[PDB]
Amino acid sequence: SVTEFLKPRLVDIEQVSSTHAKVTLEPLERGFGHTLGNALRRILLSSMPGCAVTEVEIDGVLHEYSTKEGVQEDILEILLNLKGLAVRVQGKDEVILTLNKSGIGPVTAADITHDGDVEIVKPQHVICHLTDENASISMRIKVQRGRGYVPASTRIHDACYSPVERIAYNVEAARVEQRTDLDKLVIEMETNGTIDPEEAIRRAATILAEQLEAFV
């Protein structure tokens, strides 16, 4: 048919460890390199369903510009490490965990209480370091479910519901037998929120198809 366009055939991915990856789509029509790629970039960063830390209550100090007794890392530095911690909830919408630990040494994520619905992908994830003698801590940490990035400033009365850490697409021209210019879309993606790159890109494209369905 004349009106029908040439579809892409991927069948080529470069996986560099669990988190980082580099997926590619070779045959794409004139103007379809930046198109799709820029739309997927807008989708991946904004709309990527997941779970992350929102609210935290510590037993020692009530405010966020102070220091806990027996910890070298400040409360502001701990809050940043809490964002990097990967959390996945099956049945529950919201869940409140407890960090029960004490003793001389580093705090592994495996120290946290293992609840029924609760699951952690990285038990070596460093949260904070405990100094000599004794010192003790027991904070209740809250997790919330959402769509995109919601900062602390917007919360009146720093969440990252996106598994993606960084996204970057690169467009270079390519040859196809009796042709001049077909764009070659190479989507470099970095993740941490428990999602695979093949699963993330498939779910992102599915969201655009549901939106386009009513238009078509």
| Lookup: tokens for 200 | 């993330």
Tell whether residue 155 is a contact of another protein (CB under 8 A): no
Closest to a second copy by CB, 51 vs 195, is 51
Q: Please choose, out of 22-30, 136-144, 150-158, 194-202, the segment that lies near a second copy by the rule CB under 8 A.
A: 22-30
Q: In whole angstroms, give the CA distance from residue 163 to residue 213.
A: 26
If one asks whether residue 198 binds another protein (CB under 8 A), the answer comes out as yes
169 by DSSP, 3-state: which? strand
The token pair that represents 64 in the structure block: 């966020």
Dist CA 168 CA 190 (whole Å): 9
Report how far apart the first and last C-alpha atoms of the chain are (Å, whole number).
Answer: 19
Site string for a second copy, 134-153 (x = CB under 8 A): --------------x-----
Interface with another protein, residue 32, by CB under 8 A: yes
**x/- track of binding to a second copy for residues 77-116 (CB under 8 A):** ----------------------------------------
Say which DSSP state 111 is in.
G
What are 64-71's contacts with CB under 8 Å, separation 24+?
68/137, 69/135, 70/130, 70/131, 70/133, 70/134, 70/135, 70/136, 70/137, 71/128, 71/129, 71/130, 71/131, 71/135, 71/137
Measured CA to CA, the distance from residue 58 to residue 87 in angstroms comes to 19
Q: Give the residue with the Cβ less far from another protein, 48 or 97.
A: 48
**Is 171 a residue that touches another protein (CB under 8 A)?**
no
Picked from a second copy, another protein, none, the partner binding residue 186 (CB below 5 to 8 A depending on kind) is none
Q: Does 23 bind another protein (CB under 8 A)?
A: yes
Q: Which is nearer to a second copy, 11 or 62 (CB)?
A: 11
Which of the choices a second copy, another protein, none does residue 155 contact, using the CB cut-off of 5 to 8 A by kind?
none
| Residue from 19, 24, 35, 194 binding a second copy (CB under 8 A) | 35
- Applying CB under 8 A, which of residues 98, 134, 170, 211 lies at the interface with a second copy? 211
CA-to-CA dists, residue 163 to 12, 44, 87, 147, 212, angstroms: 23, 9, 10, 10, 24
Give the nearer residue to another protein in terms of CB position, either 63 or 91. Answer: 63
162 touches 193 (CB < 8 A):
yes
Q: Which residues bind a second copy (CB under 8 A)?
A: 2-3, 5, 7-10, 25, 29-32, 34-36, 38-39, 42-43, 45-47, 49, 148, 208, 210-215
